Amino acid sequence: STGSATTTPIDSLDDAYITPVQIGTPAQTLNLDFDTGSSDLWVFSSETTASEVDGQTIYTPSKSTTAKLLSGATWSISYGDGSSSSGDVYTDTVSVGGLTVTGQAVESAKKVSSSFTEDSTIDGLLGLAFSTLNTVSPTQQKTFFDNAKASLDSPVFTADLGYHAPGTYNFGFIDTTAYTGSITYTAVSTKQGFWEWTSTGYAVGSGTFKSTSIDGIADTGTTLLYLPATVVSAYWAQVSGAKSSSSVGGYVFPCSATLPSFTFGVGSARIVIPGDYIDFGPISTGSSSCFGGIQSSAGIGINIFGDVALKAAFVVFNGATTPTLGFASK
Numbered sequence: 001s002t003g004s005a006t007t008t009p010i011d012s013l014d015d016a017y018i019t020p021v022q023i024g025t026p027a028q029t030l031n032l033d034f035d036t037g038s039s040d041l042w043v044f045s046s047e048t049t050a051s052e053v054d055g056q057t058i059y060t061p062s063k064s065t066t067a068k069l070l071s072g073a074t075w076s077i078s079y080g081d082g083s084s085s086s087g088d089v090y091t092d093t094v095s096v097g098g099l100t101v102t103g104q105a106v107e108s109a110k111k112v113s114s115s116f117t118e119d120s121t122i123d124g125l126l127g128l129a130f131s132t133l134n135t136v137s138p139t140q141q142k143t144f145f146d147n148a149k150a151s152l153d154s155p156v157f158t159a160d161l162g163y164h165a166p167g168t169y170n171f172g173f174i175d176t177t178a179y180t181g182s183i184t185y186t187a188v189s190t191k192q193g194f195w196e197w198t199s200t201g202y203a204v205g206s207g208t209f210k211s212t213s214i215d216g217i218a219d220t221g222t223t224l225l226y227l228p229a230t231v232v233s234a235y236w237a238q239v240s241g242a243k244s245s246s247s248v249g250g251y252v253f254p255c256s257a258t259l260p261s262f263t264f265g266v267g268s269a270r271i272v273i274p275g276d277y278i279d280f281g282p283i284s285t286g287s288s289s290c291f292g293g294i295q296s297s298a299g300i301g302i303n304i305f306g307d308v309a310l311k312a313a314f315v316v317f318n319g320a321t322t323p324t325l326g327f328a329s330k
């Protein structure tokens with residue numbers, strides 16, 4: 001089997017991407033944030049504290065003839081941005097772009113963090129990291145991909161995120177028309193439950209390539225590119241007027257400035273992030289100071305290849321017995 005679904009930016013800055021997901025019988029379609037940095041499929045629901053719902057589409061398990069309470073099961077999660085949610089669990093039928101999984105764990109939110117409430121465009125998350133990170137207790141649950149894997153033509157999914165435009169998530173096949181050149185594959189460690197790999201280095205604009213190992217995670221659920229302070233300093237030093245602002249919480253720059261590209265290494269291959277991708281607009285409405293899309297990972301404990309990096313490539317999440325990651329230009 002295969003599946004193919006379009007993923008769409010939630011706003012003009014590509015802060016996140018939403019993908020339609022059919023849940024239950026008859027289908028209830030929710031727009032979920034596909035997140036390769038986490039492993040819970042959780043949704044706003046009829047059970048969510050009413051004051052914490054503000055515009056989102058909810059899942060109502062009582063209206064689904066295939067929904068079954070996973071008795072005794074609870075879930076609770078906290079994300080890297082300080083957001084969180086918790087609730088109970090149903091199994092139900094979940095379809096993405098024509099690919100159907102029966103008995104998928106659907107985690108119903110009873111409580112969500114204010115940041116989720118405040119984003120009316122995201123109805124929940126669909127986690128695509130390794131199932132070892134799943135927070136369901138007492139019985140850990142499998143991700144949508146884990147459940148689908150044996151049925152897929154090939155045990156892979158691909159992320160093809162657009163710049164200020166829709167893109168595509170495919171399951172079970174590699175669309176050879178979606179990228180240029182070849183796909184370079186690179187080793188993955190699953191020890192932290194992430195799609196964790198090691199970049200071979202970086203260049204800033206037309207600058208010479210610096211060969212240096214950068215360990216990080218491929219994370220569709222994170223907006224920006226978070227890299228070591230040395231690397232990030234080298235980048236912003238090439239932007240006139242750029243400064244790290246403690247009160248803003250990162251590097252800012254005047255948008256009258258021209259951003260250089262940023263290249264990262266995948267084995268001997270190179271992915272180029274155009275400078276335009278690194279512009280995230282005024283820090284506040286009407287401000288002449290713009291927020292940068294490359295920021296320091298120093299306070300995080302891990303480097304994150306977020307949407308800023310991934311949307312510059314066609315990315316293969318290979319769930320073979322020994323998982324790997326593939327990157328191609330496009």
Ligand SMILES: CNC(=S)Nc1ccc(Br)cc1Cl
Pocket residue numbers: 015016081119221222223224
């Ligand atoms: C909130 N944390 C991250 S990485 N990203 C982000 C920024 C702004 C909006 Br609106 C939504 C998201 Cl998901």
